[PDB]
């Protein structure tokens, strides 16, 4: 994860976190997350720490490298912000996504024919994605979650600090992980800048399709 | 126990005596009124001169005249 200038944060990964707006946190605060916070602005916005982004982007991407079968990874977003960020992710690591609407009693219930049984849960937001995680109790499920300063920490085993509500911010955190797992396997080089573009993983609003199809000519 | 001191020993012991007189199967025991009332006076059997035969009715649900004596 660190000490090693073979896994370290690059000059080519500072002007993507700033340009999207992932460091820009909130006003309210839960008592657990004050060890990922630098200092408050005069305006009312919590600036999230950026060394503790990289040192906690690779540990999580250290568990997914320690996971044995590509299938078992249950990736989720209910919310419509990053549902093109959990499906293209599946089109790089070979996970099993469930985007849009969780059918409760998925993990817990046998007799159904939607019957799942993963070994890791990578969920885009604990607060919204509530029903996922309580199920992560009744069967034992080492959990990951892209949390914020706001949310409570019920059934999660790592807390990655970032602004996870925006259009530029959710889909940018779903490429590095997939980058930094694929680099940790040897399928993309640490050398060649990775051929895929970061805008492949942001979800498309129905208001900028009327901008893009209608203005091409 | 509630008054936990090391030299209380009497405070503790004036309170239970006081108390046990509230106990029924005891006060019924520790006053002279139980044996003043009682026909046998304090005893397991005691003989007597009959004087008339008498039928007593029974109480409800049940009914049937019950055959008694007056001694």
């Amino acid at each position: 994860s660190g000490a090693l200038d073979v896994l370290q944060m690059k000059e080519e990964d500072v002007l993507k976190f700033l340009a999207a707006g992932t460091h820009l946190g909130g006003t309210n605060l839960d008592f657990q997350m004050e060890q990922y916070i630098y200092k408050r602005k005069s305006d009312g916005i919590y600036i999230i720490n950026l060394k503790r982004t990289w040192e906690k982007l690779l540990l999580a991407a250290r568990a997914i490298v320690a996971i044995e079968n590509p299938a078992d990874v249950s990736v989720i977003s209910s919310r419509n912000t990053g549902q093109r960020a959990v499906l293209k992710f599946a089109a790089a690591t070979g996970a099993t996504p469930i985007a849009g609407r969780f059918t409760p009693g998925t993990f817990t219930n046998q007799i159904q024919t939607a019957f799942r049984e993963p070994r890791l849960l990578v969920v885009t937001d604990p607060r919204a994605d509530h029903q996922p995680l309580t199920e992560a109790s009744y069967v034992n499920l080492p959990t990951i979650a892209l949390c914020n300063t706001d949310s409570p920490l019920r059934y999660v085993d790592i807390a990655i600090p970032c602004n996870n509500k925006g259009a530029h911010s959710v889909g940018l955190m779903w490429w590095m992980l997939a980058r930094e797992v694929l680099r940790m396997r040897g399928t993309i080089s640490r050398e060649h800048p990775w051929e895929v573009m970061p805008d492949l993983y942001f979800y498309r609003d129905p208001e900028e399709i009327e901008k893009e199809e209608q203005a091409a000519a | 126990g509630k008054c936990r001191g090391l030299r209380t020993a009497r405070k503790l012991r004036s309170h239970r005596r006081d108390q046990k007189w509230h106990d029924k199967q005891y006060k019924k025991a520790h006053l002279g009124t139980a044996l003043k009332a009682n026909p046998f006076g304090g005893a397991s059997h005691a003989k007597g001169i009959v004087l008339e035969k008498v039928g007593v009715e029974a109480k409800q649900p049940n009914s049937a005249i019950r055959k008694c004596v007056r001694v």
Binding site: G2, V6, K51, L59, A66, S137, N140, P142, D157, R183 | -
Partner: protein, 83 residues
Amino acid sequence: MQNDAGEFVDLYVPRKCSASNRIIGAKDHASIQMNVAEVDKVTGRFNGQFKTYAICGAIRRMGESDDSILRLAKADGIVSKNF
């Protein structure tokens, strides 16, 4: 778990939490096992080995599940010192 004569009598040794020293019971589901991968110091790739851990069911819903793995990580040199 013996008599005098040293022979191991009790039918299974349970797990124990790597965080707090509380034994992880048999009908305790919000348990966890989590392996974490190691990575070659010059190559930046998987070595073929990990650094396992565990967390019990009483600690997760209490709130302190994401500040016990970092107190166990850090100390085995996975994560750097200053953080």
